[model samples]
Target chain A: YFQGMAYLSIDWGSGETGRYHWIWLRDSCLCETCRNAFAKQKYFDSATLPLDIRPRSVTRSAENGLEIVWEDGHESRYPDSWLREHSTRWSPWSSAEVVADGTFAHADVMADNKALVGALEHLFRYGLVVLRGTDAEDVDPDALCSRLAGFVDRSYFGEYFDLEVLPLHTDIPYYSTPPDYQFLFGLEVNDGRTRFVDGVAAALSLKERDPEAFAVLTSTEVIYRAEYGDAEKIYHHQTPVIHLNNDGEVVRLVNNPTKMFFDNVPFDEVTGVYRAYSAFKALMDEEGRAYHHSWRQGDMIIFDNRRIFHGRRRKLRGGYFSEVELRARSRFADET
Target chain B: YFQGMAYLSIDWGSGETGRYHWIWLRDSCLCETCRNAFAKQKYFDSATLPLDIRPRSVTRSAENGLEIVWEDGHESRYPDSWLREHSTRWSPWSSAEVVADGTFAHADVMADNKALVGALEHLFRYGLVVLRGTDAEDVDPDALCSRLAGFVDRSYFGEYFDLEVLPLHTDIPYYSTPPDYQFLFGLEVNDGRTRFVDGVAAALSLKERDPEAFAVLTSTEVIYRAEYGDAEKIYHHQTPVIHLNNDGEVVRLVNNPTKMFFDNVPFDEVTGVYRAYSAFKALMDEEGRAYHHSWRQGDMIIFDNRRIFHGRRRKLRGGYFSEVELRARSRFADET
Candidate 1:
């Protein structure tokens, strides 16, 4: 250890504060351990070393500029010149400045009790945030649902692999609302029914054929089921109810479904359908200004299983896995 | 006439040059007649002055400094300083350099002539020359055209107004070769009828109605004939082919087919039709890349009536009339 004149004091709220130093050593050490480590990975292993070091008691002596007595009854000397160059002398501890008083005290208390509340506020304002720089880390689902301040639910079908089915209804008596919650936000991320451009073209061509009829149906308030499926898969089909407002505008498109069945489907065949559905959902949410919690590491997302909808794009092999830890929380007395 | 020792001698080449000397006068007379004839116009009127007292030669004397000797032996004296200050030597004449050579040299002959050919070449290249410090009264259109090897043809369509049409085409077709004459080239400017964009659009639209039947017939050539009247003076209607090319592109666009029928129309209406036709023809010819000419004074242009088309845009009141000299030379040497 280099000699220093004074002890370095770190203020890390309780007893965690201490002096810390890091260094990147030159590669060419002749030591056997260094050679062996370099042979394996070309880098040093400093995991065993403490990140911060602290002394038991502070003292001063003429021979040893600043002396620190350790818990093991060992003593170390720090030179005055080294202390002047490297240490922090004038701080809350030495100067008795009462740094944690006033506004800071309130901030510290709030941070301890409502850290997630402050984080959510910041995230909502910024649009994107990261907890651990990796999607695989667990996230608390209950915390996510709380931060959104909206009703949340889930489906029995796996998020990305599920499909929502609607009962066949007659055109003569158009329904204003579907009969069940499953029909509300029914979507299957990996179900391809028609090519996107071809679908839009077909719609436009239909408009050309009977503009008046199309206009009437589109402009009037009505609920219709959008049936989609991977024709190749043949078994699974998703039929979600879409609400159209006056002016021929589709007001809300739902994608959450009650079931998912893709036991025999090949992975490659389902990829495109998943991507298209994800893109469509993204576009719809962006257009509809829907509230959503983007996946974040260390974020636990939990919601009502019957009400909340979730889906994902098909994941490629060797691709990054986004891990989120989910924990259920309730304000109701029974849940606690 | 001015003088002392000449510092530089400029060989103007056309036997036209001016000498300088100083001159001064006492008793400055600013009479109306003097001012009107000489002082105001800044040029002496030799026509009205007595022949004996008229200035014949300008010279310098020791006592009077500057003196003018009359044709019949009378002399007038002015100060040398006054003559030097008032003459062209003080401020050079504006167009004097342009006309320094005898102005009426034939351009073609001068092109080959070597004697001071550079000056002649300069004038030939510019095609038109202007003389300053002179009113329109000093202009001689015939002389100017002759000097540039251009022929002038004058037309009197009405009183007090004469139009000169310039022919840019050097070639005119001959039906039969005469004795001692050969035809070099032929200009075919207006052999076919004019077709307008509106008529073509209408025809195409009509063809769309009966695509099969018109397919074969429309393959043959057609023209759009412009109507001549006050209300719809420039209206174009489809007409059958007047001349047919192999590929059927019109070699020339016809002008004013109704010019002969002017008697049947009212004078003002006929004039309007004439003006419209003139504008249309000008636009047609202007669209051609080879036909370009600058409007100038006293130019009479005569182009082949059948081979060259000519017209003008409708004129605004108080517009500047271009004076151009034009003449058409026959392709046959016998005719020339």
Candidate 2:
């Protein structure tokens, strides 16, 4: 909060506060004059900044976004959203895997690798996005998938198989480590809608209810799987439901309702896993926690397949239900 | 054979041969008195030795293994099997990828991770193996699959659901680059022999017949998939049937006999691919090629799920069949 004087205070809402002086704030002005936007186009540099700068007037918005009219009669605006976004390098998101705003036109994305990098980074940040203006009708889903990987996987119900599989679900559960992204593309998608949800809230809720269950969800001692007969080769595989990082934050969840196989629940933490699973399953219907994306004309989407889980919310549609994969390998989107 | 006192010659049987010298081969010796078998723990230090160390006598065994008595009364034995295995790594075996020998007692392997590494390396080299002397009943197959990969994939008859499904195929034809290992472990002696095959011989036959059909098998204009009924969410995914790699080697193949959905394949290519697939399918039944491993109690097996295609070679016998994954990414067992 700017105190109408030479200094200002910042209360981050967690009871922590930071105070800044007028000269310091002025020196840090990041408008077009202070710095360039992400593309690194240059702006003003700081050398002999004013030593005795004072604010002519100052005020704080509801989000502590700052507005300052300086002694030099220059004004600067700060949006708290930008502050919240860049304050840390994935320092930790309170609810880390939600799909936030920002969509792009396919044309722009295809023309500039830099734009695609931003799109992927946004996915890395929020875990999901809507890529607009793509030719989604019968999109080549794995076309881009192969760009990231070289081999194909078998299918379930529409997976990236020799031809297809991998629709909506966090394969991270089955894969010891899931890929960074999952995708879906469509045109006029309606009726059967695709659902995308972030598991943070529900996963965290496990800790609130049964600490042991939460622990079980996060541990590797248990197994999960799904299976069928017909061929002896296809058996069940089990994986941990949710995996937590060193910060103790629930960063990822693996889910595939129908595919989950059963195993011995011994090792003492079995029941806790069941409860943890319940919370994870419940997260699906929580109000507004997920993105219910249907389609219209052109749309391409990507989500953090590792942390974000997707599923078929409804299926009776009549729309452009298409997906495609561009090209890439574990190394890059370039040559072998 | 030590042709001269200073050097030795090696015959690898395919009209190919190699030569080395007394001190050089001695320095590379891996016997207990020369080098530690597994740990490379050195027993003999490389230092100044007689300029003219000679072999008192040398002979090539029936299997071409070498045995020699040295000038200084040193003894050395070089098994051609070890030499061949380390030379070009996974060179042409008539059938390419089947475990011909060696089984371990569960106690020995369980007690040593180094031993386990050798078992897995053998699987990579040969493409299939059976681990004897272990419980065959409902074994934890994915338990080891996760050490190699974190994700479990969907199957047609079997995949990632309560029940499953996947075609007789490699899972990720569209994954870009799929996991390097696939798993199947069976417990009891049973029917429904698992099928395995080397595509190299048959695929090369295509280059001899339909060069263009071979081109279609090697093209990226198609996709593949598997699915359960739901939304048309069961969409077609495109991938190459016989995908080639750097230097244009038919490095891998992704097949799902029935799961491959159709698209606009120019009739010319359509027939050629069918012929090519017919050749691939025929390779499955080729005599002396592909392992049709059945099970016995205490039997654990692994195969090159990525390269060698698998299916129910035979069926309808009661038994427990399990599958487990062991190592690597989409490329080779050695390279990333």
Candidate 3:
């Protein structure tokens, strides 16, 4: 255990290290005094916690894991498993590897609980995965997404979309909190192939290739706007091309080069922003950085809209699920 | 007409005066060179527009309406009707009046286009409206929301919730950009009364009664958090108790007194925030400010969740729809 003025860092074993703030630790304590065991909710008034709170003592050992005694005489223990789960880094994968490794069978996922959870875990790791043998023309798309994750997220596109007329322009990256996961089920197949690019992977590559362009992309806000003459009049939403969470992790990439407006960018940085966007788009277009899937009748693909950038040469049917719902679905794994 | 260094103000008849930035005026030009007629989308590169663009001439006539000649020799005209529509203020309502006037008959709405638009217009003004006669136990809640807006917005609570077990904790106040509209269908009624408080009205009253409290409530951010074992684990979202749009219009109020935490508030301002919250809650608790409706079976109530605070003393069945979709539905009115 190592302590700083505001935070405590713990070596969670197996190369996992987490630096949790004192306030967070105190607020998240699982003790009976702080939490309602049945509901798993905190009961204490968080504002009552002193801002400059310090631990009276902190102890960590191979056997005991981590223990802390607060200045208020309250004690908290962090389990090694919990610490490890919270400390693991979220990683991105290149196109070739994810395409090779991310296919699951529909029969197995639908029948086996473990297989279902396995598919979800793969989605969490790589941002996209395919479910094969969903090609039964009668297999309902609505039932598929609802079973996997609570409900199908609805938008202007309706409950579910058919591939005959792709409304890809109504995708989630245009919104502030984009839809979490989307499923595209193939009921019929053509010789055509659909392109999928891991946006986070492409962004990471751009960061290494040209740090200045990456910085410009992450900093400059552009507008996602649409006015489809009354059917859908999406107002201007200003966002950077790349979205980073509070932890500075790249969580989403909103790139609709044709439909996006650069008016929100500072006049002086217009050239720089355009150059950065060009570089990012080039990375996305790179053949080796993209996964092209040839559809077979009955194949269904579930991907994270916030993490992947996709384009047609094709789809059969599609719907969406929120991220929190996916995590809730993952909780089912603990049951069996 | 009045011109500032960066903005131009025009008196669009009546009391409606609009302040438009020079950049906005230039970018929004509807000339052939700027906008595509069929798509109603902009064509010119908005980033290329000069920041300091000014009108060479401005003229207004009863017949010709407002006309502008820009520095770049671009001519534009704003119709009197368009000016009035764009310049009108959005108003809030007190319960005493809305209760007397907010009910709509289900049959009329379903059959007549004007009647449907009338109900929507009422919702825009008062933030809530009621549709009577949905009590046919067979009436589908999904179909009701879909016809009225576009689709049923799902959450951890699923597609639609029945009042048998009120899941008030899963309400939209916990979200940053809360669901725009929600529908509560009264399939079966209890003798219990349902209370509705116009949040914007309450917030406006607080501003007049206690400016200091109002300021604190609007400025201080608090956390809306929830944790349920397995099913749903909502993380913390920091937002003010009262949310105001860029135009300073009170748009939403997130008040989950029990589920909210004030730890995000600065240590010095915690007491001020609490006092403000107490004042706001007192206003909400004031019986006169809230509209109480004794339920009638088959009565469906649709309200803007972003603008209204509601509680049961009873709901019957409820679901949500996004704001953009509602606007899209409003577009259907033009067809007639």
Candidate 4:
């Protein structure tokens, strides 16, 4: 009986520069021509187009260059070159075994893109993954989201939603959107108000009851609330809502639209917000799968729009909120 | 009623390279030489010497500047050039009163050579002098001794007599000199048998009487017995004995022939010896008016052997001992 099989080999270059490699998935490109024609946009970056990426279901085409079948029954073939370059060939079997074993095991080996993608994909299919040894230092939630999908930079929602457009005063009462409410307000319109609120309440209820399910289902956006007095207070105020998700994934809708207009939080609170955001990102990414592409200090990431959703945990209490944008061309004809 | 008064001043530049200065005495120099010799030595370098040599003490003078008296009764006289270059003028009055006033008023002034000579002569006559905030940091103990009529480098009679010469060790046996023995051994050593057993019995008796005092006085150089089977036992050893003077003066007489060597003694006996020696020296130097100079990180003090008898208090456990000899010279008999 082949109780267990073992294959051993030396990694010659492993010790030289330590271990360094990059892994990424390759799917059929929605070329610029196809994308532009589809969107009817005057100018656009095809690379920024969103793909309907989803979790893989089975290993039916593993022999024919690693095929992944998405939830919507769409199938994409990853070339052997992509798999070999993106996967750990020397330890491909080990990598496969990690995903096959379970979410916890997959999370454990998710230190590189291949491992991370495998783990995240595995988690996506399994609905839950156990992350071990994840620390706040390892993540950049915004960047992570950008890599997995398109990011919604807090800066681009127009004047009413523009942080700088708000008045800076403690006594002056101004309406502010809570992160949970921001998603309901930003993604849906007044016509769909009931549906939006219901959707949010449903999502939140799910988050409170089953964090794992809520985390997988929700796409979060990290929003800053500048007008909130004491940045720390703002963060603290939002933490209860953000951490409502029982599992690792949390959706934070950047709600306080007027936050950027004033120094509403304490300096420490501002710092705390940045720190928390970064750390939360690290924890999630580390839990989902280790990405092969190490983050350069200032590098920016762009991700798929439909597949990956992003959110920021509470910033340090007194952090300053800055606007950021992720430009995109819509595929739907009547885009909002 | 007018209280006794004195005036003093300090001149930075005088004599050769602005180094030498003059002082006068109210009383005559008892020694045959009307004038004492003063020489600047390399040890006067700021790095080596504990005191500064810039300030000179001055007071009233009599008998054509041959006799000088300082406000503090410390006096000596050199040439008029010394006074002329160092101070604008000289003042006359009781040396003690001036020093007391100067100390009280925190005066920055110093006296000339004539005034210094006068003070020294006066001190010799009166047997005491009180220096007020005299910038003691600049007063060289050796230079002060040289100005006096009769003083010499103290001699080490032998190892038994010189406690300062002994190398300190952690646990072995050693005995302090006569005064110390008197304090530590007390009545027990009156029998005077030079043997370890006799010493041990005396130590035990002393310890029984006053364990605290016994512990304070005695110390061991060797850590363990040589006969012990453990290899580490061989490393335990004894140190040489020496006498330490209160004026930061250390005299080593480890191999001197005049003293008896006791290889082993109870630790209590060592403490007793240190105390007795310290007290004895203090009493002996009372007439000469010796000053105890506290030891600091960077200090080197000198002593007047004929006038000041000095000894050190027993060091507390783990105290550091360090010293460097800059130079040594014996006073010529003819000069005295």
Quick one: best lDDT, which candidate?
3
Q: Candidate 2 on A215-243: residue-level lDDT in tens? A: 76777444433222222122234566776
On the 0 to 100 scale, the lDDT of residue B299 in model 2 is 54
DockQ-best of 2 and 4 = 2
Per-residue alpha-carbon lDDT of candidate 4 for residues A1-336, written as tens digits (9 for 90 to 100): 021211112233545221111001212322352223332221321122223233344342436754544444545454454433322301111012332343332123333444445433443332222233232434343333333223332211221131110110111011122211021111111110010011122334454655554443233322222222211111112222143333433333222222211122232233333333333332332323322222222222222111122222111111111111111111110122
Q: Flag regions of model 4 displaced more than 4 Å.
A: A1-300, A303-328, A332-336, B1-336
Query: Candidates ranked by lDDT, best first?
Result: 3, 2, 1, 4
Better of 2 and 3 by TM-score: 3
Query: Model 1: per-residue lDDT, tens digit, A1-336?
Result: 234423345444556443422211111122454433222221232222222333466665657676655444445555655444332200111111221121111122222424433333232222122232223423333333323322232111112232232111111111122111111111112321110111122223334655543343233321122211211011122232233444544333333221211112233322223333333333322222222333222322221211122223421110001111011111111121
Which stretch of 10 consecutive residues in model 4 chain B shows the poorest summed lDDT? B320-329
Which prediction has the highest DockQ against the true structure? 3
**Against the true structure, candidate 3 has what lDDT?**
0.69
What is candidate 2's lDDT per residue for B34-84, written digit by digit as tens?
655543334432322343567888887876578878878888888887555
Which residues of candidate 1, in runs, are more than 4 Å off? A1-137, A154-250, A254-336, B1-336
What is candidate 2's TM-score against the reference? 0.36
- Least accurate 10 contiguous residues by lDDT in model 3 chain B: B165-174
Ranked by lDDT, the better of candidates 2 and 3 is: 3
Report the C-alpha lDDT of model 1 over B1-336, residue by residue, as the tens digit.
Answer: 333332112223466442321111111112343323221221221112331122456666677565555445545555645433333301111122323342332332222333223322332232222221122433344443333223222111111132222211111111011011101101111111111111122223334554432333233222222222221112222322112245533222222232112222222232333333333323233332222323332322322232232223211111011111110100011121
